Amino acid sequence: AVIPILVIACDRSTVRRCLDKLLHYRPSAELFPIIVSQDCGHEETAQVIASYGSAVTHIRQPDLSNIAVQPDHRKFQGYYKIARHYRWALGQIFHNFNYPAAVVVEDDLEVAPDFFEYFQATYPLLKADPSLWCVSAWNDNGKEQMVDSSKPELLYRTDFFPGLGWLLLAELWAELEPKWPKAFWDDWMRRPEQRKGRACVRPEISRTMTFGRKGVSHGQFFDQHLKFIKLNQQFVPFTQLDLSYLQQEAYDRDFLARVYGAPQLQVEKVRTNDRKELGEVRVQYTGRDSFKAFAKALGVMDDLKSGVPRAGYRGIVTFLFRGRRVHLAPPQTWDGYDPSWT
Numbered sequence: 001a002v003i004p005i006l007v008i009a010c011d012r013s014t015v016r017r018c019l020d021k022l023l024h025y026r027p028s029a030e031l032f033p034i035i036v037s038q039d040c041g042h043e044e045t046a047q048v049i050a051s052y053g054s055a056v057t058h059i060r061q062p063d064l065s066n067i068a069v070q071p072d073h074r075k076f077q078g079y080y081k082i083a084r085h086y087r088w089a090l091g092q093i094f095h096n097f098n099y100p101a102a103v104v105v106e107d108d109l110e111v112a113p114d115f116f117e118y119f120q121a122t123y124p125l126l127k128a129d130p131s132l133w134c135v136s137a138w139n140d141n142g143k144e145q146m147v148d149s150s151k152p153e154l155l156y157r158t159d160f161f162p163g164l165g166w167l168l169l170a171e172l173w174a175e176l177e178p179k180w181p182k183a184f185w186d187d188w189m190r191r192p193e194q195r196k197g198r199a200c201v202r203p204e205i206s207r208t209m210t211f212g213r214k215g216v217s218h219g220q221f222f223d224q225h226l227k228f229i230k231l232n233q234q235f236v237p238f239t240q241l242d243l244s245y246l247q248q249e250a251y252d253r254d255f256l257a258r259v260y261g262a263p264q265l266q267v268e269k270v271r272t273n274d275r276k277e278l279g280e281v282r283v284q285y286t287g288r289d290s291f292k293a294f295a296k297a298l299g300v301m302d303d304l305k306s307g308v309p310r311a312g313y314r315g316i317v318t319f320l321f322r323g324r325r326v327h328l329a330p331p332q333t334w335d336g337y338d339p340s341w342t
């Protein structure tokens with residue numbers, strides 16, 4: 001199947017860094033056509049994209065008019081424009097170009113050497129397991145000291161939609177387009193009304209990194225969190241690996257058994273690196289206050305979207321802490337997310 005890479009651009013000429021890496025690693029022009037959809041009408045950015053010639057297909061969002069926002073959103077016009085562009089660009093990919101799937105990449109993302117290999121290998125999983133609705137290149141807790149550099153091949157399922165370099169099927173666009181929101185499209189997909197309990201595949205080591213400090217949003221989130229996610233640099237031949245462990249029936253039995261079979265250790269002991277003979281442990285949280293407390297104590301992202309923690313799966317957040325595998329998890333009686341955990 002032909003899987004286009006849809007690059008979303010606007011007014012940053014640094015889309016050059018994004019395209020340079022994509023084109024450098026692309027293993028096949030036929031299998032991975034690059035379509036750059038540009039919003040905004042920024043001339044310099046338009047010239048940069050055009051300079052790539054036939055290496056890419058340059059399409060332009062047609063409606064550059066200002067958008068009438070709701071009363072609570074005067075400061076958020078940019079988020080409305082992003083949502084409009086996504087609807088148009090994805091519509092072009094699935095309706096005009098009629099591709100079966102697409103990998104969405106924002107102009108300020110740099111891809112890893114094995115970005116294409118990763119999606120080539122996981123497309124079949126997504127196509128075969130309806131409990132999955134995406135494959136993302138992003139590990140929300142992917143800071144260098146929180147990932148195992150000796151396991152660049154390790155993948156997980158996550159209930160938290162990461163975006164930032166993600167694959168979706170035309171089947172999903174058919175589902176989302178009729179109800180596409182006016183703004184904040186990513187947080188909208190994180191709601192249960194959209195997710196419907198489905199997961200995404202995400203890696204131990206992120207296959208994308210962001211360099212867009214200046215953007216639509218102010219920079220605190222990027223400055224304190226996003227900019228620290230480490231880009232994988234060790235090529236993993238995913239298409240040669242057995243990724244059957246990611247199928248829901250295998251994962252929910254094996255990964256959960258692993259998590260709850262692991263010894264529980266007090267957060268303070270993990271933090272101070274006590275009991276090092278325990279290479280893999282579980283730090284149990286029982287409420288919203290213990291979760292945020294323990295998350296912050298261990299350096300994990302502590303915000304929640306519709307009650308789901310970053311990179312969480314059945315409430316479990318998995319990461320590395322001072323060389324130890326840690327599973328920040330709820331009691332095994334867990335049975336659903338609570339959106340009131342804010």
Ligand SMILES: O=c1ccn([C@@H]2O[C@H](COP(=O)(O)OP(=O)(O)O[C@H]3O[C@H](CO)[C@@H](O)[C@H](O)[C@H]3O)[C@@H](O)[C@H]2O)c(=O)[nH]1
Nearest residue numbers: 008009010039079081082085106107184185212215216217
């Ligand atoms: O008028 C605009 C402005 C931006 N963009 C594009 O939107 C994307 C995100 O813009 P950016 O300035 O980088 O903002 P972020 O703060 O990074 O936006 C966050 O929130 C967005 C949804 O509101 C998500 O799409 C992003 O992935 C998420 O990082 C990029 O591909 C831009 O080219 C447009 O299409 N039109």
Ligand SMILES: [Mn+2]
Nearest residue numbers: 106108212215
């Ligand atoms: Mn950005």
